[PDB]
Scaffold this active site. Structure first.
Site, PDB file in Angstrom:
ATOM      1  CG  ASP A 117      -1.811   1.188   1.160  1.00  0.00           C
ATOM      2  OD1 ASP A 117      -2.096   1.995   0.132  1.00  0.00           O
ATOM      3  OD2 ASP A 117      -2.426   1.499   2.276  1.00  0.00           O
TER       4      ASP A 117
ATOM      5  CG  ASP B  39      -3.338   4.618  -2.407  1.00  0.00           C
ATOM      6  OD1 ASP B  39      -2.767   3.638  -2.051  1.00  0.00           O
ATOM      7  OD2 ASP B  39      -4.396   4.849  -2.045  1.00  0.00           O
TER       8      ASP B  39
HETATM    9  C1  LIG Z   1      -5.344   1.854   4.470  1.00  0.00           C
HETATM   10  C2  LIG Z   1      -6.048   1.740   3.147  1.00  0.00           C
HETATM   11  C3  LIG Z   1      -6.486   0.399   2.758  1.00  0.00           C
HETATM   12  C4  LIG Z   1      -6.923  -0.368   3.800  1.00  0.00           C
HETATM   13  C5  LIG Z   1      -7.391  -1.829   3.591  1.00  0.00           C
HETATM   14  C6  LIG Z   1      -7.196  -2.164   2.208  1.00  0.00           C
HETATM   15  C7  LIG Z   1      -6.832  -1.477   1.368  1.00  0.00           C
HETATM   16  N1  LIG Z   1      -6.708  -1.945  -0.021  1.00  0.00           N
HETATM   17  C8  LIG Z   1      -7.638  -2.605  -0.911  1.00  0.00           C
HETATM   18  C9  LIG Z   1      -8.663  -3.207  -0.232  1.00  0.00           C
HETATM   19  C10 LIG Z   1      -9.730  -3.847  -1.126  1.00  0.00           C
HETATM   20  C11 LIG Z   1      -9.216  -4.124  -2.547  1.00  0.00           C
HETATM   21  C12 LIG Z   1      -8.060  -3.457  -2.940  1.00  0.00           C
HETATM   22  C13 LIG Z   1      -7.692  -3.703  -4.274  1.00  0.00           C
HETATM   23  C14 LIG Z   1      -6.738  -3.132  -4.607  1.00  0.00           C
HETATM   24 CL1  LIG Z   1      -6.056  -3.181  -6.531  1.00  0.00          CL
HETATM   25  C15 LIG Z   1      -5.862  -2.478  -3.910  1.00  0.00           C
HETATM   26  N2  LIG Z   1      -6.213  -2.218  -2.692  1.00  0.00           N
HETATM   27  C16 LIG Z   1      -7.308  -2.704  -1.860  1.00  0.00           C
HETATM   28  C17 LIG Z   1      -6.299  -0.026   1.495  1.00  0.00           C
HETATM   29  C18 LIG Z   1      -7.286   2.746   3.092  1.00  0.00           C
HETATM   30  O1  LIG Z   1      -7.635   2.890   1.737  1.00  0.00           O
HETATM   31  C19 LIG Z   1      -6.718   3.453   0.842  1.00  0.00           C
HETATM   32  C20 LIG Z   1      -5.291   2.955   1.235  1.00  0.00           C
HETATM   33  N3  LIG Z   1      -4.041   3.468   0.271  1.00  0.00           N
HETATM   34  N4  LIG Z   1      -5.268   2.168   2.046  1.00  0.00           N
END
Ligand SMILES: C[C@@]1(c2cccc(Nc3cccc4cc(Cl)cnc34)c2)COCC(N)=N1
Ligand code: NA
Ligand code: NA
Length: 371
Positions: A37, A221
């Site tokens: 992330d 991101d």
């Molecule tokens: C912390 C936080 C976070 C928290 C939990 C999961 C995710 N990521 C994801 C979840 C579900 C599906 C996805 C598919 C893709 Cl391609 C990429 N990330 C995914 C991201 C918050 O939101 C934006 C961020 N950048 N980070």
């Protein structure tokens, strides 16, 4: 430098569930799959037997765990987690042959965070200390990695859109892209913030005040699926995409991401959909370059049914997986810059390909940053 065969294809995932890397925490090593992330800065792992988890960090089994005696509550727009802060020894088995002592948030309670059916158990926030929780004194993983070893201060990501890819820690692997890298400055070290200076749908300039493209920010991101656009910009953006694709028709819910659209297999009408070009601020005064993506990127398969993966934002532009899937992206922390090149693995058809081209002449690019 230039070759890291042991790190190629170290990323895995399912469509719609993100990209993860294998990591180990503790002594003896406990294996976890961790979501990569670039849009947050905490290393946080499941540490209790939540039902959705394949596995979780059991601190009691680690001789090298050190309690920090401090808690953290992290609410997001929709979900939350709380955890207990500590440190331990962390490795990446298909990464550099080093072990570092890193901060780890042991997640003890969460809501709408873990995904039912997914194969990952925590998150690796690769952004900067400024946005770490609870504050900027909790040193992010990559910072610890660089502080404690000889690993050069950069990483790169090839997201291949079931899914897979490569995270090259400490360098670039030239096999993973074609043509040249082109770099845009990191405006400020919090998120990986960049400046977009021009937007075209199929060659058609949106001709908005470029400030609107970066209201209140634009970030790269890997932890977001969509290309997200400021509302004002999204409104202009779909209007031009709808008009460009008016040949056939789909409901108005589709464009707001409120319903899927479906075609029968072997026959998705790609060509009625326009390409999207973002011009990014370049390394030289008055110089920009542009990156170009396809409907392949912004019309995402769900299981032939697709979601429209461009959406409005109140948090600014977010170049998520929709963008990164077209490109090899170099997070050149040491030079405060982000490199883009055409990805060797990007999804395309025989008519159109993703593109990174320059140099272009763009004046008043500094006016494009929101303040
Ligand atoms: C912390 C936080 C976070 C928290 C939990 C999961 C995710 N990521 C994801 C979840 C579900 C599906 C996805 C598919 C893709 Cl391609 C990429 N990330 C995914 C991201 C918050 O939101 C934006 C961020 N950048 N980070
Ligand atoms: Na170092
Ligand atoms: Na190459």
């Amino acid at each position: 430098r230039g070759s890291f065969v042991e790190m190629v294809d170290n990323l895995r995932g399912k469509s719609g569930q993100g990209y993860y890397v294998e990591m180990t925490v503790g002594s003896p090593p406990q294996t976890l799959n961790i979501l990569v992330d670039t849009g947050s800065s905490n290393f946080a792992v499941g540490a209790a037997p939540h039902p959705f988890l394949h596995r979780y960090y059991q601190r009691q089994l680690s001789s090298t765990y050190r309690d920090l005696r401090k808690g953290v509550y992290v609410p997001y727009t929709q979900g939350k987690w709380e955890g207990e802060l500590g440190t331990d020894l962390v490795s990446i088995p298909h990464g550099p042959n080093v072990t570092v002592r890193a901060n780890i948030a042991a997640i003890t309670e969460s809501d709408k965070f873990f995904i039912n059916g997914s194969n990952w158990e925590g998150i690796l926030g690769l952004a900067y200390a400024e946005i770490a929780r609870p504050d900027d004194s909790l040193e992010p993983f990559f910072d610890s990695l660089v502080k404690q070893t000889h690993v050069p201060n950069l990483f790169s990501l090839q997201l291949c859109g079931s899914v897979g890819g490569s995270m090259i820690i400490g360098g670039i692997d030239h096999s993973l892209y074609t043509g040249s890298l082109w770099y845009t400055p990191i405006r400020r070290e919090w998120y990986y913030e960049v400046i977009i200076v021009r937007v075209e749908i199929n060659g058609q300039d949106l001709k908005m005040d470029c400030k609107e493209y970066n209201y209140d920010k634009s970030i790269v991101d890997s932890g977001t699926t969509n290309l997200r656009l400021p509302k004002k910009v999204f409104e202009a953006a779909v209007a031009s995409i709808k008009a460009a694709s008016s040949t056939e028709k789909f409901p108005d819910g589709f464009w707001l991401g409120e319903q899927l659209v479906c075609w029968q297999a072997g026959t998705t009408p790609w060509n009625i959909f326009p390409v999207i070009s973002l011009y990014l601020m370049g390394e030289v005064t008055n110089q920009s370059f542009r990156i170009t993506i396809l409907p392949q990127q912004y019309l995402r398969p769900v299981e032939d049914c697709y979601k429209f993966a461009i959406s409005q934002s109140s948090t600014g532009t977010v170049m998520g997986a929709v963008i990164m899937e077209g490109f090899y992206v170099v997070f050149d922390r040491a030079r405060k810059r982000i490199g883009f090149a055409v990805s060797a693995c990007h999804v395309h058809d025989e008519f159109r390909t993703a593109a990174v081209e320059g140099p272009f002449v763009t004046l008043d690019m500094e006016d494009c940053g929101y303040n």
